[PDB]
């Protein structure tokens, strides 16, 4: 509890129509996207973390959304430990909570900026260093302001999800319509799929000769992967419509007949991201320990790196499948990888639906509070009925998401199942929210 006077965006007093919200979302996205391509002035790793944090080095957006996401996760953890003991009956407490979030996020921004400028590869040699610190400071401050703006109500929804979906879609299009070329002995071969296909159709003009080469392209992206990714995109859109609806009726106010839907992707985003973070952390720590220590019994047993990839170790088994060749080579590794990822995703969905407060007991309590009851069932059996549907549905959704991720990683699409699945889930949430609200 303290006092503070800091800049912040004000919420609209009335509900904003759909068109202004769409335009503001578009403009904010354009500004955030431009901000990440301009190089710094005084200038003279793992792709996984930079892709999931939606940031790239050598530009004004070096830190990305890392401070916002880490502040949000830290405050989520603090709320989970029941240490802040926040009471929903007080709004000043929530305002203080949010102002504490902001004041710790800005401190983390400053600390991370000082760290990266002091130890980064820019160099030890002072006004240039001050300017280089101020640039990153002001850039990340503007990004925080934009996030808070989109979150106050001027935007369709959250901002971090939108930025991540934007980077994913941009990478997916760049792996298809790339204008760059690489001249390796034979000549110029485009780095895009459709571009290279049309180019080989035009300059070579030999149908059966050029098509067979443009279709496989063992070294560079081709049309087969684009077709596979559009097919799996259609399939993922199809799998969202699966939902169980149970009939409910009210007892407090009669004449109220309704339906409560239960989707298959109950908590879709959580298990995939948690599993990806687990795998990335395991791989990173294994690489670090095998780089520091030359050879040890436990170090060799947990993982050995070679050509770089892990092999002959526990970290070797967790490595994803590359294609059908390695799949048919070692069947035991493929089988153990499949069962491991499926069990992990299932247990993750279970523990997350248990900890998120969406258990059948919690929703039954919410029903009893609201007074809704099943049309053709009694009152003292609602929890017993929800026990027969909710956990099974959650586990099945987790399992099918994991299977789809394995299939995407194996069939060789342009992007992993995780990224495409995240983008599709976010856009589907946006669309269903806009539909249930009602608007063009």
């Amino acid at each position: 509890p303290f006092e503070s006077f800091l800049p912040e965006v004000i919420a609209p007093e009335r509900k904003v129509p759909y068109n202004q919200k769409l335009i503001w979302t578009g403009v904010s996205l354009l500004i955030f996207l431009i901000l990440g391509q301009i190089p710094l002035y005084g200038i003279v790793p793992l792709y996984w973390l930079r892709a999931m944090l939606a940031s790239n080095r050598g530009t004004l957006l070096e830190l990305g959304v890392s401070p916002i996401i880490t502040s949000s996760l830290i405050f989520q953890f603090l709320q989970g430990t029941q240490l802040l003991q926040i009471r929903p009956e007080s709004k000043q407490d929530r305002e203080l909570f949010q102002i504490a979030q902001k004041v710790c996020a800005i401190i983390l921004i400053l600390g991370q900026a000082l760290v990266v400028v002091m130890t980064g590869n820019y160099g030890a040699p002072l006004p240039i260093c001050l300017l280089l610190i101020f640039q990153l400071m002001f850039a990340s401050l503007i990004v925080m302001l934009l996030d808070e703006l989109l979150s106050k109500g001027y935007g369709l929804g959250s901002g971090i999800s939108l930025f991540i979906a934007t980077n994913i879609a941009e990478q997916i299009f760049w792996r298809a319509f790339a204008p760059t070329t690489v001249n390796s002995g034979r000549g110029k071969e485009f780095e895009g799929a459709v571009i290279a296909f049309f180019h080989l159709l035009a300059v070579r003009k030999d149908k059966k000769r050029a098509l067979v080469e443009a279709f496989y392209r063992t070294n560079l992206p081709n049309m087969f992967q684009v077709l596979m990714t559009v097919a799996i995109f259609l399939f993922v859109l199809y799998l969202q419509g699966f939902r169980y609806e149970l009939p409910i009726r009210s007892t407090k106010v009669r004449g109220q007949i309704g339906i409560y839907p239960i989707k298959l992707f109950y908590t879709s985003n959580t298990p995939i991201i948690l599993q990806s973070a687990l795998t990335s952390n395991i791989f990173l720590i294994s690489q670090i320990l095998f780089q520091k220590y030359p050879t040890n019994p436990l170090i060799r047993l947990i993982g050995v790196w070679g050509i770089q990839m892990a092999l002959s170790g526990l970290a070797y088994y967790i490595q994803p499948l590359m294609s059908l060749s390695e799949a048919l080579l070692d069947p035991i590794k493929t089988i153990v990888y499949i069962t491991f990822v499926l069990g992990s995703c299932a247990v993750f969905s279970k523990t997350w639906i248990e900890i998120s407060g969406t258990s059948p007991r919690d929703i039954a309590k919410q029903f009893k509070d609201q007074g809704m009851v099943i049309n053709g069932k009694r009152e003292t059996s609602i929890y017993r009925e929800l026990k027969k549907i909710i956990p099974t549905a959650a586990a099945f959704g987790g399992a099918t998401i994991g299977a789809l991720s394995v299939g995407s990683d194996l069939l060789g699409t342009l992007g992993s199942g995780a990224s495409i699945l995240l983008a599709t889930t976010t856009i589907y949430g946006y669309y269903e929210a806009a539909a249930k609200e009602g608007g063009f």
Binding site: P7, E8, V9, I10, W24, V27, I31, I34, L35, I38, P39, Y41, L60, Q135, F138, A139, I142, L145, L146, L149, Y154
Partner: protein, 32 residues
């Protein structure tokens, strides 16, 4: 307290200042 157009104006001024500093530092080396 802060209006959205003010945020947009700050962001645009920031980008413009960075670009201007770059082009001036480049033309300084080019001319001298």
């Amino acid at each position: 307290r802060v209006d959205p157009l003010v945020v947009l104006f700050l962001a645009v001024g920031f980008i413009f200042s960075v670009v201007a500093l770059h082009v001036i530092s480049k033309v300084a080396g080019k001319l001298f």
